[PDB]
Nucleic acid binder design. Structure first.
Ligand SMILES: [Tl+]
Ligand SMILES: [Tl+]
Ligand SMILES: [Tl+]
Ligand SMILES: [Tl+]
Ligand SMILES: [Tl+]
Ligand SMILES: [Tl+]
Ligand SMILES: [Tl+]
Ligand SMILES: [Tl+]
Ligand SMILES: [Tl+]
Length: 95
RNA sequence: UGGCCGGCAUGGUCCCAGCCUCCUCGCUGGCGCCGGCUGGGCAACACCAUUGCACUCCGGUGGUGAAUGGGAC
């Protein structure tokens, strides 16, 4: 069931008490050094809360981030990271 | 009061201060007691449920069942 490499990483187990806008800014803070980020998609709906899609421009970036930040304490919770199942439209509209 | 009716108590006007609050956060809002009818919203705050793969915002419930004193005429 393991996913294949993707420009986008999927993060979950994120503290749900954090507002969308702050969450996006914070995530960008810790993940930017891995490479250019095209966007970070967060939502608070029942189905999507506690998860986020950080979309990296280059898969290598999505790969260090995934290995380097796995389990990183963030807002008191261990961040769980994977590769997103399919592509993000921002990436389709290019690659 | 978010919108509305009743009961009771209470002389008036004004100044200061404190305080209160989901629905015009303040100095031309309110701040004796009690019952009842009933709308919006989850934006903020709180709580319940949720470990969930998206690229259209989008689960639920709760709060006003609130808050005092002094002074000048
Ligand atoms: Tl009311
Ligand atoms: Tl009355
Ligand atoms: Tl009097
Ligand atoms: Tl009086
Ligand atoms: Tl006031
Ligand atoms: Tl009443
Ligand atoms: Tl209501
Ligand atoms: Tl819908
Ligand atoms: Tl008084």
């Amino acid at each position: 069931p393991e996913t294949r490499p993707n420009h986008t990483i999927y993060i979950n187990n994120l503290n749900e008490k954090i507002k969308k806008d702050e969450l996006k800014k914070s995530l960008h803070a810790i993940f930017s050094r891995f490479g250019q980020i095209l966007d970070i998609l967060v939502s608070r709906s029942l189905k999507m809360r506690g998860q986020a899609f950080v979309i990296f421009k280059e898969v290598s970036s999505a790969t260090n981030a995934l290995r380097s930040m796995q389990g990183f304490p963030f807002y008191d919770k261990p961040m769980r990271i994977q590769y997103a199942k399919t592509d993000s439209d921002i990436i389709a509209k290019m690659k």
